[model samples]
Target: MLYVEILGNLPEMARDEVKAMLELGGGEIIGQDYLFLKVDAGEKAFPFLDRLGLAHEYGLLLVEADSVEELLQKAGEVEWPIKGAFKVDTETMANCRHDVLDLPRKLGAVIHAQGFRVNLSKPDTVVRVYCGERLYAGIRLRYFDPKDFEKRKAHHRPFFRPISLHPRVSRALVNLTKATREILDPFMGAGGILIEAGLLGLRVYGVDIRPEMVEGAETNLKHYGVRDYTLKLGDATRLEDLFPDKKFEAVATDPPYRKRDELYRKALRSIYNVLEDGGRLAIAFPTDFNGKAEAEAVGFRTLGRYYQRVHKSLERYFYVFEK
Candidate 1:
C-alpha cells in the first residue's frame, strides 16, 4: 500500500485538494486522506506523485501474502533492512478497537528486552505487524524522509512570516505548465515559490529588488541543495528590463500585499508582459487586498481563486490567471 503524509495542522480542504490531484494522475484511493494505490507495479508511484507535488512524505507498506512459516524464514534473511537507526513498533486492529493499552504494554516489554529504545516521537525504523482474524504482518522498508531537506521554516530572513502557498496550490500551478518549461517568480521573497517549483523538477527563476532578500533566498536554496535556480537583483515591476527577450511558461509568485500596494500594482502589470502566450500565472494575496479587480483590469482572465486561512487573524487568497 502507498501512503502520502500531509503537513501537520493542514486543513481538510487542503487534503481534499491533494486527493483531487492524485486522482487526476490515475491513482486510486485505497483509503481516505492518507493512503492510495495505482496498481502494485514497480517504483513508478513515487515519481508520479512527486510530479504532482501532492506527496509531502510517502512510504510503501508491504502486505504479506505468504504463509507464516515462509514469512518467518524471509524475515530471518534480513534482505530488506530498515534504513534508519531508530526503532518503531506498530500494531493493527481487527475491528478498530478503542483501547490499545494491552498490546502496547506487551509489545513495549518485548521491544525493550531486545535492547532498542522506544522512540514514539520520531522513530527511524518502524516495524509494523498486522493482527486480525487471519495473520498478516510486514515492515515498512523505504519511506520518504522529512528531514532529508531543509524546510521553509528553517529560513530566518526578515519579514519572512511563514505564509506559504499550500502544496496542492503549488501542484496545480505546476500542472498548468508544460513539461520542462521554466517557472518565474517575480516577487520571490526568500524563495518559497521557487522552492516548490524546483521540487516539481521545473527550472525556476526568481527576481527581487532587495539584494539582502535575494541573498537570503540563495542561502535557503543552497541549504536545501537546490542548484537549478537563477536569482536576479532587479525590480519585479520591470522584469522585461531584466530579461528583454525572455518569457516564462508560468508565473507563480506571492507578491507583497501587507504594506506595498503601489509595488503590487506595478508587479501585476509586469507579470502580464513577461508571460508567454497561453502561459499561466498563480498569485497569492491577502484576503482583504482588493487586487482581483486590478488583476482583471490588466487584460488577464481570472481562472480561479482559493482562500487559505493560515492563522486566526491572517488569511490569503490564491488567484490563478491565464492569458
Candidate 2:
C-alpha cells in the first residue's frame, strides 16, 4: 500500500488531483485528513508520487496499529530498506491524543539500532507516519521540491495572459483527465495548459481561431522546451474541421467568459463527438454557468465538479465529464 500526503495547494480540489494521478497508476483508495491517499498498487506508486504537483510526501503503508508502540513492534516483520542515511518524520490528525514529537524521537533511536545512520539534514530516506483513522508509516520514496512549481508560474511563461489559469492548477486539471499520452486544448490562449500537459510527457495539440494566439502559443511552447506539439488556427465549435482523423485521449481547456452560455453548450457537444467513448474532458468556466445538466443532456457522464475562487470578483468552476 502507498500513502500520499497532499500539499493542500488547492485545498478545494487538491485531493481530486491526487486521486487522478493515483488512478493512472491503478491506485484504489482503501482508507482521511488534510489531503490523504491510501492506495494499493504496486511499484507504480513511486512514479505517481514523483509526478505529483499537489502532493508533498508519500511512502509505503507499513502496518495499521492502535498506537505508536504497536507499529514499532511489527516493524521487525516488515521488510525495511534502512541502509542509507535516514530521518523519521511523524504527524497525527489526533491533535491532542499523544505528543507528536515523541514518536519521531523514539524511532530515530530504533532506526539507528537497525544499522541505519540518522541524518537530520540532507538525508535521502524519510520515514513518514500517519495518525489518521489509523497509524501508518513507510520509507519515503519521492519528495517534490516546492520550488520547482514556483519557477513555472503562469507569468513566468514567454507568452503571458493576466487572466490565465495558474500553471499548477492547469497541470492539476490535466491530471484530472487521467490522460498519459495526448491531450487537446481548444482555447490555447497562452499555452499554459498545453505547456503543463507537455511537461507531463503528453503530446499536446492546440487550436485557437485567432492566428495571433496560435502564433504566440507556438513561441511559448518552444520557450518552455515543449517539442511534441501541434498548433492550428481553427474554431473550437468546429472540431470536425480541426482534425478529420484525430481522436485525443482527453481534452483540457478554459473557455472565454463572454458568450459562455451558448459556447458551453456548443463546445461540450462538439468535444463529445471528437472525444473517445471513455475519454475525459475538463473545462474551467465562470461560476454562473450551470452546464452540468446541459452537459449530461448531450450524453455525458459527469465525473465531478470543483470551484476555485481566484478572488472576490471571480471564481472558476470546473466541470469534468466522460463520454
Candidate 3:
C-alpha cells in the first residue's frame, strides 16, 4: 500500500491534484482522512511521486492500529524494510490527543532488535508514524522539498507581483489542467502560471495588455530558466487575434479584479476561441465574481469549483472549465 501526506492549506485543491496524479498512475484510492491518503498502488505510482506539488511525503504503509500497544505489535510482526541506518518519527494531527512522546523510541527499539541500527539524525531510511484517531506507520520513499518552491516565491523573482499566486498554488493550478504538451496564460502577471508550466517542460504562451507586464513576465520566466515560451503584449479578450492559428492544450491563469465582471465574459469567449476541443482551462478570480456563469455562457463546461481564502478579508474562487 502507498500513502501520501498532503498540504493542510487548500485541502480541496491539494486532494484533487493527488487524485489526478494517482489516476494517471493507475492507482486506486483505498481511504483518506484529513490530509493523509492511503492508496493501493504498485511501482507505477513511484514515478509520479516526484512530480507532486502539494504533497509532503509518500511511502509504503507499514502498519496501523487503534492504540500504541497495537501499533507496536503490528509493526514488529511485519518484516521491516530498511537499508543502512534508520530513524522513527511521529506526526500528531490536530485532532489527535494521544501521548506520543515515547512512541518513536519504542518503535525504534522494536526495529533495532530486528538487526537495524537506529540513527536519530541524517538517517538513510525514515520510519514515519502518524497519530490521529488511528495510529499509522510507513517507510517514506520520497519527500517534496518545500525549499524548491520557496526559492521561486513571488518576492524572490526578478519582477515581483504581490498579487501573483504562490509558486505551489501556481503549480497546482497548472497540474489541474492535466495539460501534456502546452498551455497559455491570458493574464500572465509575473508569469507565475507560465513559469510553473514551463518547468514541467510544457511550451508556455502568455499575453498581457500592458507592455510593462509582458516585459516583467518575460524577465521572471527567464530568471527561472523557463525556456520554450512566448510572451506577447496583447489584450486578454482578444486571444483569437493574439494567437490566430494556435490552439492550446490547456489554459491556466488568474485574471485581474479591476472591471472583472464584464471582462470575464469577453475573455471567456476569447479563451474558448483559442482552446482545442476538450481542452481544460483552470482560472482564478475573486469569490464575488460569477466566473462559472460567464465561462458556461461561452460554451465551456464546468468541471470543478475550488475556493481558497487568501486572508480574513479576501477569498478567491478557482474554476475548471473544459472546451
Candidate 4:
C-alpha cells in the first residue's frame, strides 16, 4: 500500500484526485488520511503518482520483512547513498537529507557526501526509511510536476481573469463535461482554459471581439506550445453567421459581464446556437448575473453551478448548461 498526502483545504478534492489515479492504475484505496491515502496495488505506485501530480506533495514506499532486525539490516545497504531519511515508525521512516530535517543529521551527512547542495527548506529528493525485520527505501518521487505548477503560476498575467479560476478548477470543469471532440472558448482572453483543455488533447477554438485580444491569446497559446487552437477576431453574438456548419462537442467560456449585459446575452445566445444537441457548456459569468434564470430563458437547461468570490468586489459564477 502507498500513502499520498496533499496541501491543506485541498484534502477532499486531493483525495478524490488520488482515488481516481489509483483506480486508473488498477489499485484500490485501503486507508486514508485528511490528505493522505493508503493504496494497494500489484506494483510500485510511483508512476501512477507521478502522472497524477500527487508525487510532488507526498508519496509512499513500503517494504516487507520478517522482523525489525531484518528491515534495519536492509536499510544499512541503501541509507549511505540517499540524501535524507526519517522514521515514520519503529519500522518505517521518511527522510530527505537534502530537504526534510525532522529526523537525525546522519542522513544529511550522507546527502552532503554525495556532493548535492542541501536545502533543508525544500529539496526534490525525499527518502522513505522503513526499518524492521526488513528494511526498505524509496526516494525521489513527487505528487505533481514542479515545472508544470511553476508554469501555471508564472503565466498569471495581470488581466488574466482571476486566481480563483485555478488550473485545477478548469481541469475539473473539463473533466465534468467529458469533452471527447472539440472545445470552444468565447472569451479566450489569455487562453488559460484552452491551455488546460489542450493538455487533455482537445482541439480548441477561441474567439475574441477585439483583434488585439486575439493576437495576445495567440501569443500565449504559442508560448505554451499549443498548435491546434484556432483563434479569430469575431463577435460572439454572430457565431452562427461565422461558422454555421461547425458544431462543438463542448462549449467553455468566461464572458465579460461588468456593465456589458447586451454583449453578454448576445454571446450566450450564440453559444447556445452553435452547441450540439445534448452538448455541455461551461461558462463563467458575474455572480450577480442570475445565470439560472438567464440560461433557462434561452432554452438551455442549467445542470450545475459553481460560485467563487475571487475578490471583494468580484465573484465569478460557473454555470453548467446542457442543450
How well is each residue in 204-279 modelled by candidate 4, as lDDT tens digits? 8998888777887777677667789898888888888877799788888766653477777777788889989988
Candidate 3 per-residue lDDT, tens place, 112-165, comes to 999999989789999999887778898999988899999888899889788788
By TM-score, the better pick of 1 and 4 is 4
Model 2 RMSD to the real structure? 2.1
lDDT for each candidate structure? 0.60, 0.78, 0.86, 0.61
User: Candidate 3 — which pairs collide?
Assistant: none
Could you estimate the TM-score for every candidate?
A: 0.59, 0.92, 0.92, 0.60
Q: What TM-score does candidate 1 reach? A: 0.59
lDDT of 2 by residue, 127-206 (tens): 87777756777877777677777777767767766656767778877888888889999988878889888888889999
> Among these predicted structures, which one has the highest lDDT?
3
Clashing pairs in 1: none
Q: Candidate 3: list runs displaced more than 4 Å.
A: 97-99, 311-313
Model 2 clash tally?
A: 0
Residue-level lDDT for 267 in candidate 2: 86
- Per model, state how many residue pairs clash: 0, 0, 0, 30
lDDT of candidate 1 over 234-273, digit per residue (tens): 9888999998999888898877653477777778899889
